A paper describes a structure:
The SAD (synapses of amphids defective) kinases, conserved across a wide range of species, play important roles in multiple phases of axonal development and function. Despite the diverse functions, the AMPK family members display similar structural organization, with an N-terminal kinase domain followed by a non-catalytic region containing an ubiquitin associated (UBA) domain and, in some cases, a kinase associated (KA1) domain. The C-terminal non-catalytic region of SAD kinases includes two short conserved regions, SCR1 and SCR2, which respectively contain the characteristic UBA and KA1 domains12731. In this study, structural and biochemical analyses of mouse SAD-A revealed a synergistic model for the autoinhibition of SAD activity by two separable elements, a newly identified autoinhibitory sequence (AIS) and the UBA domain.
To unravel the regulatory mechanism of AIS, all the AIS-containing fragments in complex with KD-UBA were subjected to crystallization trials, and the complex structure containing the AIS-KA1 fragment of residues 519–653 was determined to 2.5 Å resolution. The UBA similarly binds to the kinase domain from backside, and the AIS-KA1 fragment sits on the top of KD-UBA. Comparison of two KD-UBA conformations, in isolation and in complex with AIS-KA1, revealed that the AIS-KA1 binding does not induce a large rearrangement of the kinase domain, and that the major inactivating effect is likely due to the influence of AIS on the αC conformation. Consistent with the trans-inhibition results, the non-inhibitory KA1 domain makes few contacts with KD-UBA. Contrarily, the AIS sequence, adopting an extended conformation, makes many interactions with both the kinase and UBA domains. Two consecutive aromatic residues from the AIS, Trp522 and Phe523, penetrate into a hydrophobic crevice between the β-sheet and αC helix of kinase domain. The following Phe526 and Ile527 stick into an adjacent hydrophobic pocket formed by residues from three helices, the kinase αC and the UBA α1, α3. The conformation of AIS is further stabilized by multiple hydrogen bonds, directly or water mediated; in particular, Trp522 and Ser521 from the AIS interact with two acidic residues Glu87 and Asp84 on the kinase β4 strand. The extensive interactions ensure the stable complex between KD-UBA and AIS-KA1 and reinforce the inactive conformation of the essential αC helix. More importantly, the AIS sequence pries away the N-lobe β-sheet from the αC helix, resulting in further separation of the pivotal Lys49 and Glu67.
Residue numbers in the entry:
A (entry chain B): 13 to 276, 287 to 344
B (entry chain A): 519 to 576, 585 to 599, 606 to 636
The structure:
Amino acid sequence: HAQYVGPYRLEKTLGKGQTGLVKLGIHCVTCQKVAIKIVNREKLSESVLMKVEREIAILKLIEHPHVLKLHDVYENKKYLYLVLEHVSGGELFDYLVKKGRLTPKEARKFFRQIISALDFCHSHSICHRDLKPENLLLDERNNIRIADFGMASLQVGDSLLETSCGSPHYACPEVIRGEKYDGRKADVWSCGVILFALLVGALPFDDDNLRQLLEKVKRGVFHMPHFIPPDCQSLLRGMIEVDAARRLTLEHIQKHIWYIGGKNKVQIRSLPSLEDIDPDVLDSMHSLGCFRDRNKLLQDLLSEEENQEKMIYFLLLDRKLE
Amino acid sequence: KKSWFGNFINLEKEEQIFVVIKDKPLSSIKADIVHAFLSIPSLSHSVISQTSFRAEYKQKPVKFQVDITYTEGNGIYSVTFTLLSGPSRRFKRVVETIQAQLLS
């Protein structure tokens, strides 16, 4: 007998185990397809869930050609149901398997699509924090759509007994060590590892022993295959750089000669008074669980610091101008 | 199952609320809707099809449509509420009380 998530009828499983359970949903009136990621919420704390909702709130309001779109989130006592765009192209690395290794030009094409999505999400204060091949989906036209922005804290696991740790092959050392870190810097590192994989068909850091793999990651030493052109190599080394202070920023990546090749937005103002604050926008915001505290939201909009509260507000305000 | 973003924003060209009804024939479903309508004194409605209604709640009046459509499984139905004109907030409220009737 048929299970539903709001209007979506649940059908087959598209993905299972690690990286979570995913089901095909079919809208019972429009017959449109969606992918529904099912996440057990029993062990997630409230503040974790509120922090995630705030980020998802932003994602629900922005759009990029290489970011998988989220339609909604449904909640009961045990599960979150994340209702996502459905794509039909499989995974980027399925492609890399068939080819063994990508052409530099072809690697540059997908690389630009990724950097552009990262830049867009970062400039809206959204980091990925756990960028992996599984997150790199392909659409109808073989364009990348990146899954799971804003969802690193959900810890979608294979096992109820085992906590999901993230994929260490693609993680920067500061994430491995459990340190405070800049999510932007972590995405850059992960993005360098993925690029290395596109070009080489193998990982920079790999080992049959998990402890040894972690050592290798922290160490940052890897073999650069000689066929990789020297400008491209310097870009990989600037991304896969252990010192987070010296690691390349996105702006420097986009200015890199290899990035360029050789062929040849919401505006955050400040709210001086509460009289300036839009009541309709305030009510939209207050409808979210992460904003039950009306006064705390006002404080967060009236303060000088840039925060996700302001990001949502202005995204909603501009959405209202139309 | 509650939606996080159902009262947050509408990205779609039409503002809509869907309800899936599990164990009721079409006659029960229509009877639930009409009961809910009559239970709302400031709301008049009319019948515009064997499977659809128009209503108006009365500042600007909320005008909307209610459609019943058969899904394909045993028989499950869906009810679609479509805002024609008027404030969203008042529309959501009215729909909540109709929906509550439909679910019990």
